[PDB]
Amino acid sequence: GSSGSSGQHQEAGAGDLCALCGEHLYVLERLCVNGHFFHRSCFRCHTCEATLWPGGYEQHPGDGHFYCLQHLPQTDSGPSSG
Numbered sequence: 001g002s003s004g005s006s007g008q009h010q011e012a013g014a015g016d017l018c019a020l021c022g023e024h025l026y027v028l029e030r031l032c033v034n035g036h037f038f039h040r041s042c043f044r045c046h047t048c049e050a051t052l053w054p055g056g057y058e059q060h061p062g063d064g065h066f067y068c069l070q071h072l073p074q075t076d077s078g079p080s081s082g
Protein backbone atom coordinates (compact mmCIF):
# COMPACT_ATOMS: atom_id res chain seq x y z
CA GLY A 1 0.00 0.00 0.00
CA SER A 2 0.89 3.69 -0.20
CA SER A 3 0.34 6.07 2.71
CA GLY A 4 2.13 8.59 4.90
CA SER A 5 2.22 7.09 8.39
CA SER A 6 5.43 7.10 10.43
CA GLY A 7 5.69 7.93 14.12
CA GLN A 8 5.58 5.13 16.69
CA HIS A 9 6.89 5.12 20.26
CA GLN A 10 8.33 1.83 21.52
CA GLU A 11 11.43 0.32 23.13
CA ALA A 12 13.15 -2.97 23.94
CA GLY A 13 15.91 -2.42 26.49
CA ALA A 14 19.30 -3.96 27.20
CA GLY A 15 20.13 -7.35 25.71
CA ASP A 16 19.65 -9.14 29.03
CA LEU A 17 16.27 -10.82 28.58
CA CYS A 18 15.42 -14.48 28.03
CA ALA A 19 14.77 -15.61 24.45
CA LEU A 20 11.93 -18.07 25.03
CA CYS A 21 9.57 -15.52 26.59
CA GLY A 22 11.59 -12.31 26.66
CA GLU A 23 11.54 -11.30 30.32
CA HIS A 24 14.19 -9.90 32.67
CA LEU A 25 17.10 -12.19 33.53
CA TYR A 26 18.98 -12.53 36.82
CA VAL A 27 22.68 -13.08 37.53
CA LEU A 28 21.91 -16.51 38.97
CA GLU A 29 18.97 -17.32 36.69
CA ARG A 30 20.34 -16.39 33.27
CA LEU A 31 21.85 -19.15 31.13
CA CYS A 32 24.77 -18.08 28.93
CA VAL A 33 24.19 -20.22 25.84
CA ASN A 34 26.03 -19.12 22.70
CA GLY A 35 25.77 -15.53 23.90
CA HIS A 36 22.01 -15.74 24.37
CA PHE A 37 20.46 -15.92 27.84
CA PHE A 38 17.60 -18.19 28.90
CA HIS A 39 15.55 -18.80 32.05
CA ARG A 40 16.44 -21.84 34.15
CA SER A 41 12.83 -22.90 33.60
CA CYS A 42 12.40 -22.00 29.93
CA PHE A 43 15.60 -23.78 28.90
CA ARG A 44 14.23 -27.27 28.24
CA CYS A 45 14.23 -30.10 25.70
CA HIS A 46 12.41 -29.79 22.38
CA THR A 47 10.84 -33.25 22.59
CA CYS A 48 10.41 -33.74 26.34
CA GLU A 49 10.73 -30.10 27.42
CA ALA A 50 12.85 -31.36 30.32
CA THR A 51 14.91 -28.84 32.30
CA LEU A 52 18.19 -29.02 30.39
CA TRP A 53 20.76 -28.79 33.18
CA PRO A 54 24.23 -27.34 32.47
CA GLY A 55 25.99 -30.60 31.66
CA GLY A 56 23.23 -32.95 30.56
CA TYR A 57 22.24 -31.59 27.16
CA GLU A 58 23.52 -30.93 23.64
CA GLN A 59 22.73 -28.57 20.76
CA HIS A 60 22.36 -30.61 17.56
CA PRO A 61 24.30 -29.01 14.68
CA GLY A 62 21.92 -29.96 11.89
CA ASP A 63 18.80 -28.00 12.80
CA GLY A 64 20.41 -25.87 15.48
CA HIS A 65 18.28 -26.45 18.57
CA PHE A 66 18.81 -27.84 22.07
CA TYR A 67 17.82 -31.41 22.92
CA CYS A 68 18.47 -33.83 25.79
CA LEU A 69 21.05 -36.62 25.65
CA GLN A 70 18.14 -39.00 25.07
CA HIS A 71 16.37 -37.22 22.21
CA LEU A 72 19.30 -35.41 20.60
CA PRO A 73 19.30 -36.48 16.93
CA GLN A 74 22.33 -37.10 14.72
CA THR A 75 23.22 -36.22 11.12
CA ASP A 76 21.94 -38.86 8.71
CA SER A 77 24.42 -40.51 6.34
CA GLY A 78 24.94 -43.78 4.51
CA PRO A 79 25.14 -46.49 7.20
CA SER A 80 27.13 -48.89 5.03
CA SER A 81 27.12 -51.13 8.11
CA GLY A 82 27.68 -54.88 7.94
Ligand SMILES: [Zn+2]
Residues within 6 Å of the ligand: 018, 019, 020, 021, 022, 023, 038, 039, 042
Ligand atom coordinates in the same frame (compact mmCIF):
# COMPACT_ATOMS: atom_id res chain seq x y z
ZN1 LIG B 1 11.95 -17.34 29.28
Ligand SMILES: [Zn+2]
Residues within 6 Å of the ligand: 045, 046, 047, 048, 049, 050, 067, 068, 070, 071, 072
Ligand atom coordinates in the same frame (compact mmCIF):
# COMPACT_ATOMS: atom_id res chain seq x y z
ZN1 LIG C 1 14.17 -34.94 25.39
